[PDB]
Amino acid sequence: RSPLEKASVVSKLFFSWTRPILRKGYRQRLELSDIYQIPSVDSADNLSEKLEREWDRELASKKNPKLINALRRCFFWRFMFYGIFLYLGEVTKAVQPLLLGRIIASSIAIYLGIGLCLLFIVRTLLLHPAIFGLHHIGMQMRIAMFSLIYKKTLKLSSRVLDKISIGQLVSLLSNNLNKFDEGLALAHFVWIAPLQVALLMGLIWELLQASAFCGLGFLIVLALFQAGLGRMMMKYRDQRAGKISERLVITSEMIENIQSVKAYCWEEAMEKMIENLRQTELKLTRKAAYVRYFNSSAFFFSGFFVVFLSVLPYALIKGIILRKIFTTISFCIVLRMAVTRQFPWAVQTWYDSLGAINKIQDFLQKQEYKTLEYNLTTTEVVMENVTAFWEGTPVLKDINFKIERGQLLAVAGSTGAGKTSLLMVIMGELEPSEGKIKHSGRISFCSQFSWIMPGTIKENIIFGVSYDEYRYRSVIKACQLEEDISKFAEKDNIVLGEGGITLSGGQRARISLARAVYKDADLYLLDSPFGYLDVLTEKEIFESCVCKLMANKTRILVTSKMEHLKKADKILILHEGSSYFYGTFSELQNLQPDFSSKLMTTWNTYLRYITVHKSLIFVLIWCLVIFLAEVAASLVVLWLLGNTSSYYVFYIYVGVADTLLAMGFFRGLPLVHTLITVSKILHHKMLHSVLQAPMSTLNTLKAGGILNRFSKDIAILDDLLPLTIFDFIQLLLIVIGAIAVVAVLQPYIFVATVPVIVAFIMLRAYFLQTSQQLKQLESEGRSPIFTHLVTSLKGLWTLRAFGRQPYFETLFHKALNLHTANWFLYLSTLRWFQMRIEMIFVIFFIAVTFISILTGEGRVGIILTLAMNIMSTLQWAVNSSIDVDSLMRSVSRVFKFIDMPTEGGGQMTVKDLTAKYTEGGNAILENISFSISPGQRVGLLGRTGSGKSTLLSAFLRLLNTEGEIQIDGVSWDSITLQQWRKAFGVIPQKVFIFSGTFRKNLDPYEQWSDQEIWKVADEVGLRSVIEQFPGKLDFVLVDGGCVLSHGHKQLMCLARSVLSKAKILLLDEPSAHLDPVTYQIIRRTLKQAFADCTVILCEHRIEAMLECQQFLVIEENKVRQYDSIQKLLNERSL
């Protein structure tokens, strides 16, 4: 079934079976169903059970459950089977320069060249398949662990689950979703790196005769210093972290109230604030970047000293042959690479991996839910001596009841009086330590908060069972659902989405009652499912199935109805956490008559980026001119010396490629600084261009999809991309310079190197298309896992009460396998690309070596000493190219935002008002006309409730609107919008208060006098409500102005409107928002001190706006008018 079960060994080895998708992924787009099936052994269901067997074996064998030592018997052995291969692959790398250091002798060298080419072939065979298998073991680990974690998630008691932090689960799972899988190509370097040195410091001793340690000590100094830079980096990034949240909260707030900023004309204030916050964040990030450059440059200036200090003493004491320079250097590369990068990566990998395993081990131990011994045999359900604590706080006062197998009881009380907790106990999700609460235990549930799964109506109303036509017909016609079935689009199999928004409250309640009464259980706990259906609909359902079809059997509802509780064979009414009274229906309805009566990626992007900043041109030109002149200088000195000991000890500089062309401290820093300044410029201009997009465009961009263009891309553009571009330039420069040096020594390397560089570039272009497409596919394949996780958590109570855990286990396993296919395929194709790269390098080396040998002393030494160890930096250059082309996507999406357009007396007149949300949608008005009168209101009533938001907002020119407005002699044409939208003054239903001090949250432009502000505050009815604040007035209104209440915030907004001398006050929702005392305050303020602003009070109920003088009546698509109540409540309203 898979593509791997049919393949030759050679094809499984050189990754030939991945050819057809590459044969496909080049020419055309991939269709999601083109992804080959998973190999059988990687099926989640075939691994989770295996891992669980060993896990609970570790649990039941000892009382120190080291999960890692339950893994050590699952995968460990194949782990060794790949570790030994990797060890051999690295010993080959270490020992090859010895077979290099014999052919400098010159006959007897060609044979060693053949052997060395075979050494390259051995390395390129033993590395890549072993690394791929290791990554495969990593993927198996991740899948098995996720399956166990999920399967466990549906076993937690509720006492601990409602106490876990909602973000803990998502962070825990997603943390090791990509990292941990690749965190096994670097595990064996905990005992590879040591064996390499205890090998190397043998051979080098055999060469130096006294001086081994003198270089290892330098490497220890260097590595310790470089790691010490780690904390001096992390401290800066820590200090920046919370500061990023401080910058981000105001951006989120602004994004979430954009139409307020547009109406108040505050664009410049927000821009200035965002700048003044970002300044110091850039300060810290720039410091961090300089430190990180020092870090990455220490590794590049190692390669010279690591050999100069190891060569200096023995050279001093005795003259050294030249063979012991070109040879030792080729060891010095490996040793450096095996104590500075390979070791700390292994150490960090084990830290992080064992930390994550510690976390998961500490997870699986948590308190485990148990399903009670039910459905064995039982008569009438009995709940005797029931005492339960909502956290010793008694939600139940030792209650008891016997409910007959067929009878009917009804609970009632205050909302959440613990009767819900009493059911969640009788439902077995809360454990009361008192008494005996038990039943037959075959119970169905219908919770107050319905959940909607993914699938058709038959699915959410079956939950994994057959469909009986009589049962479905009775339910639908009974649950007010035969209409709800038929009325739908396809009417029987609507392919539903998630969230439940596709239906209303009534449809959702019908669906929940259906899922409840679907199958027959010895009890039906319907926790007030009749609370979202209409009263007549409630009576319909009660007469239909609630009190008709499931009443002939046992049932225990929880309802607060005055009519329903009458007909139940028992009643239990509770207050103050205890039953006020209860008993039989007649006895309860009589035992308290008073109480009973009371209760009821293009080169456009590259060039654009590189030329956003006229200093980047200069930095690149300088960096390249210095590189070119340095190549020329080293080449001329090489020729001069090629055609006192310092003469021949010069060779140690050119003889190492790295330090020749490594970015000096006077050239590598300004590039890193310039990139960060480019990030600032781009961020500022994106902000400027998202504060002026026309509002009929922003509407398309859903609100969650703009903040992520700030908190994600700009973070990348600050931290990641500058370093990656720096490393790419450094590595490409090194490679090209070394290849130039190799070329000039004899001019046959050039004409062979051209059809090798062409091959590299062609292969890279042939691969990246498929790699990027498969990356994207994996990206959208990751989402349904978390969707299913959310759906599982939300409906856990009902899920467990049904008893349908395995079905969802299988569904989650399906989603897992569906992601696993894409991941496995991407991994395999990446490794194929690496193999082809290294093989092409190997043929290039065959060419260089044989051409050089078959045609001096320093010539051969330098040629070979570069063409041997350039491969590592070449592979880094290729991987860095991949990473930079990946990271440029953020720049591309940023430029997407960069390209949006800018938006554009008291008496007045209005005509021809065309308005809609989109360009040409539903006409908000049809040539609406009116007169705006002097010094008196114009009430907006009539069809108030058909939407006054359209005309109200379009009066501020903040919708897809155009037409005719003429205010006091001026029109909507001449004056600038930023000076026209300020004449009108909004009084929004949701007042905006920036997270800052009062002087800035009320007068953000800061053009007022503090005494003027004090006067405008006191006279506007806020002095009292502002006297109770910290300090005097500088209170930082943190967390969205939580302290103030609707009345105080409304008065503040009113003062902010009174500030700029607004000549129109379109106040909306007077009584809905204001409290009663606050309503009196607002009325007495606006009528008295806002006396002569031509307000338009637009409230739905006519009783709120009947007071105003005129009435510009409201009516859909035609704004009729009755100038006075002499016809208003007689013609428009009647």
Ligand SMILES: Cc1ccc(NC(=O)C2(c3ccc4c(c3)OC(F)(F)O4)CC2)nc1-c1cccc(C(=O)O)c1
């Ligand atoms: C005693 C022993 C035997 C074998 C192993 N190897 C493993 O099990 C495997 C593994 C697991 C997680 C990893 C990892 C490698 O590499 C990583 F990616 F970094 O994370 C299957 C290879 N490990 C140990 C061991 C080590 C350290 C501590 C303990 C302990 O009992 O505390 C036990």
